[PDB]
Swiss-Prot record:
Species of the source: Cereibacter sphaeroides (Rhodobacter sphaeroides)
UniProt keyword annotations, A-Z: ATP-binding, Calvin cycle, Kinase, Nucleotide-binding, Photosynthesis, Transferase
Lineage start: Bacteria, Pseudomonadati, Pseudomonadota, Alphaproteobacteria, Rhodobacterales
Protein's name in the database: Phosphoribulokinase 1
Additional remark text: Is not found in cells cultured chemoheterotrophically and only low levels of activities are found in those grown photoheterotrophically on oxidized organic acids.
Record-linked NCBIfam families: PRK15453.1
Regulation: Activated by NADH and inhibited by phosphoenolpyruvate.
Length: 279
């Protein structure tokens, strides 16, 4: 919080994004602890793969990694709570030497000491729901989201590179995810302070026969600010070559220039944040 700021990126897990924040915390001397959003899935691979066959026997084509039930959500809240006040907490790793195993959660760590901020990247960094309020504990909430068409392509590609005897087809994997996508993911993009939305400017009208993922070059990113006060858009459009404004509060930026728009944009918020913690 004010004295232990937590920054929270929700929606994305490609992941160009971490390198960018790293580049800034290094550029600015911000000693940072971090949470990989995978670390708070309720189930390891077997448990979940199993959790899904119980469901599909009951009549339940709505459970996925997007649903709240599939995530240690209030632990994630507890930790965001704990960082704010004291600067301690825990994290796992998943997605890794401990003995490891692909498909298993490593063991919980105490949070390092003398941290300027915590950093979270995943699909639930701004959850607000009836049990847990995770948006409310983070001083900066960023959303990095693709247009639905491009999430499917992004997903159909991860799932044509690791099969199994699944018996569920991409159509059924894609639809089964819509339920928790519209119920748990979509709403979060009204909790965030700044959204970056990745929009392909190539044909994504049938995501299911997409032979490859639209590269950065073949997309634009809309960067919308919840509140555009203080923001100097001419500065920004001068600096980011190729950009223009679509509304009074959002800049469109060629997709090969995300990394630079994040630096130009985020470098000063993370400073104004690291300088009010020590004041």
């Amino acid at each position: 919080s004010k004295k232990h700021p937590i920054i929270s990126v929700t929606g994305s897990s490609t992941s160009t994004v971490k390198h960018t924040f790293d580049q800034i915390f290094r550029r600015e001397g911000v000693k940072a602890v971090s949470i990989e959003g995978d670390a708070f899935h309720r189930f390891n691979r077997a448990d979940m793969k199993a959790e899904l066959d119980r469901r599909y026997a009951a009549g339940d084509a709505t459970f996925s990694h997007f649903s709240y039930e599939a995530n240690e959500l209030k632990e994630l809240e507890r930790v965001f709570r704990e960082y704010g006040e004291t600067g301690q907490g825990r994290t796992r790793t998943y997605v890794a030497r401990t003995g490891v195993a692909p498909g298993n959660f490593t063991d919980w760590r105490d949070f390092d000491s003398d941290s300027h901020l915590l950093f979270y990247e995943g699909l639930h960094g701004a959850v607000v729901n009836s049990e847990v309020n995770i948006a409310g504990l983070a001083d900066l909430k960023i959303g990095v989201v693709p247009v639905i068409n491009l999430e499917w392509i992004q997903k159909i590609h991860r799932d044509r590179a690791t099969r199994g005897y699944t018996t569920e087809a991409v159509t059924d994997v894609i639809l089964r995810r819509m339920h928790a996508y519209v119920h748990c993911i979509v709403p979060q993009f009204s909790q965030t302070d700044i959204n970056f939305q990745r929009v392909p400017v190539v044909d994504t009208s049938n995501p299911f026969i997409a032979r490859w993922i639209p590269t950065a070059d073949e997309s634009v990113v809309v960067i919308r600010f919840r509140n555009p006060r203080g923001i100097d858009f001419p500065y920004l459009t001068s600096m980011i070559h190729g950009s223009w404004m679509s509304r009074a509060n959002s800049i469109v930026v060629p997709g090969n220039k995300l990394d630079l728009a994040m630096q130009l944009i985020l470098t000063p918020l993370i400073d104004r944040v690291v300088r009010e913690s020590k004041v």
